[PDB]
């Protein structure tokens, strides 16, 4: 703690990465095979040395060694976009509310504006004015629709500037639990209405239904003869369940998101949007995976043999297909047989990256994708973030003793020569730190290593009684750097009779099961040793129980 941190983090903003990974990372990847002969990683494949140093090389980007490079990202150029298997639940619904002929939603452009203009209000801290927009409802001319929504949108411009002049909201908006309640109710009802409808109702020009499967194929249903008659008398004045190529959905959706920018401006934004970053189609398709750094993807071992990495096996099949969806492109470029494998390639390349992320959406036990290492008590988010393992801790069998204080814990000398604590030297504690450093890490009131001003450590384990005494007299010698006039020498002393330590029975239900004690080092013993009267608070009986002593 001699190195204070300045800036801090206050608030994490989520968001979807764009197609501008190209600006940050120029380390695109083509080669699927990485471990070549003579034990080297290939330059350009998945184990490139521009993705951090790997096996005692230099990073081609950092230029640092194995352990000083943070690591680097890289992008894999897919030939076409492929829709993201997280967001398929919110594009299939937006595909079913769609029409390819009017390129609006199936609901009317006064019904759609009615829900959106409520959601402008509910990104401010006001709910009373949200149910006042339904107080304005007055073979319908274009004079009732140039003038109704002219009054609704007028009222919201009145209401916000009322509230913003008041303290009922800020520029950055108000967002509380009940406002969040009143926001999800509309959207779950907004996605109730638009999903089911008969026709597009700007017109008679409507589109036929759609149909999915297990996140792989999208099937545009054909038309019944009930409706061939409709589009030919209104739009002018093969079989069902056809496969649709994925890049035509991108022509459907992006012509929607620029027609209906404004309603979907408020669906995808719950704070008031300041910088008006527009809702686009890269929020749902993926032109590029990112490639995590090499440090985050390392092999494991069984017996003596270091075996195959699990990430790259998922990321090989995506990249071997990337050549074979590209090698097969030249044959169709040379002018059947070859359509049936190119279209088989597009089905599997979505099912490639679907295998990459969510293993429950692809073909004894398969490989865990990146979601699968995150969702249980086991996995990451509940185990290595809520449940971090610690330094400076011990556990043992406990034992009773009446002859000590009730607020103490009797500690073996094995534990008293291990757990250190940084004691900064000053003008008053130099005398109990000389006798620390004179003893060293075998005589109990001693020290294991001392920290200099610069940040370097000086061990004390290997030395003898003279060199320690040489160095135990140099503690309050200031050093001639300009940066380190303040940072005094932290001696790491052994734990003593005056430090405080925590105790922790493992089923820790109530807060008295993890209390704080003072430390009394007892020689000639082997176990932690506790008073009887502090078995009421743990309900631990002294016949085979373990207590994690954190420090």
């Amino acid at each position: 703690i001699s190195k204070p941190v300045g800036s801090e983090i206050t608030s994490v903003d989520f968001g979807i990465l764009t197609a501008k990974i190209r600006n940050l990372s120029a380390k695109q990847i083509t080669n699927p095979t990485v471990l070549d002969n003579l034990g080297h990683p290939v330059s350009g494949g998945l184990y490139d040395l521009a993705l951090g140093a790997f096996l005692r090389n230099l990073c081609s980007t950092c230029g640092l060694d194995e352990k000083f490079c943070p690591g680097h990202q890289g992008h894999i150029e897919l030939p076409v976009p492929c829709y993201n298997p997280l967001f398929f639940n919110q594009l299939y619904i937006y595909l079913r509310a769609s029409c390819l002929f009017c390129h609006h939603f199936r609901l009317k452009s006064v019904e759609v504006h009615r829900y959106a203009c409520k959601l402008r209000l509910l990104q401010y801290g006001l709910i009373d004015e949200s149910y006042k927009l339904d107080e304005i409802t007055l073979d319908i001319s274009s004079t009732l629709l140039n003038e109704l929504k002219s009054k609704r949108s007028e009222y919201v411009d009145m209401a916000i500037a009322k509230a913003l002049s008041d303290g009922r909201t800020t520029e950055r908006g108000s967002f509380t639990a009940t406002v969040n309640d009143e926001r999800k109710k509309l959207v779950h009802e907004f996605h109730k209405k638009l999903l089911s409808r008969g026709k597009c109702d700007n017109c008679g020009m409507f589109s036929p239904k759609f149909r999915k499967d297990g996140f792989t194929k999208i099937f545009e249903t054909a038309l019944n003869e009930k409706q061939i008659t409709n589009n030919r008398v209104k739009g002018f004045i093969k079989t069902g369940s056809t496969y649709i190529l994925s890049t035509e959905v991108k022509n459907i959706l992006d012509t929607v998101f620029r027609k209906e920018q404004c309603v979907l401006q408020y669906v995808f934004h719950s704070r008031p949007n300041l910088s008006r970053k527009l809702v686009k189609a890269d929020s749902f398709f993926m032109d590029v995976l990112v490639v995590p750094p090499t440090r985050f993807r390392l092999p494991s071992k069984l017996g003596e043999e270091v075996h195959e990495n699990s990430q790259n096996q998922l990321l090989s099949k995506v990249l071997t297909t990337s050549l074979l969806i590209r090698d097969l492109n030249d044959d169709l470029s040379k002018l059947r047989v070859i359509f049936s494998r190119l279209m088989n390639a597009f089905v599997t390349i979505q099912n490639d990256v679907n295998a990459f992320i969510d293993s429950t959406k692809a073909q004894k036990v398969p490989i865990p994708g990146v979601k699968q290492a995150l969702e249980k008590k086991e996995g990451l988010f509940r185990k290595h973030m809520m449940g971090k393992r610690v330094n400076y801790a011990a556990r043992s069998v406990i034992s009773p003793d009446p002859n000590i204080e009730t607020n103490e814990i009797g500690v073996p000398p094995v534990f008293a020569v291990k757990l250190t604590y940084p004691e900064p030297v000053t003008a008053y504690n130099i005398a109990e730190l000389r006798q620390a450093v004179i003893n060293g890490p075998d005589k109990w009131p001693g020290a294991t290593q001392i920290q200099n001003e610069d940040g370097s450590l000086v061990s004390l384990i290997g030395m003898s009684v003279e060199q320690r005494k040489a160095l135990a007299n140099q503690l309050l010698t200031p050093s001639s750097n300009v940066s380190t006039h303040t940072l005094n020498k932290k001696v790491y002393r052994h734990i003593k009779n005056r430090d405080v330590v925590l105790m922790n029975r493992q089923p820790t239900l109530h807060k008295a099961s993890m209390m704080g004690h003072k430390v009394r080092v007892l020689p000639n013993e082997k176990t932690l040793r506790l008073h009887y009267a502090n078995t009421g608070a743990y309900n631990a009986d002294f016949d085979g129980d373990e207590m994690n002593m954190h420090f």
Partner: peptide, 25 residues
């Protein structure tokens, strides 16, 4: 039973083994 549970506190159940999980799955 309090040996391997004393090597790691994992005294839960994998399945729910309860009637309340029917609408939960």
């Amino acid at each position: 039973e309090q040996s391997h549970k004393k090597t790691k506190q994992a005294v839960s159940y994998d399945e729910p083994d309860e009637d309340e999980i029917e609408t939960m799955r």
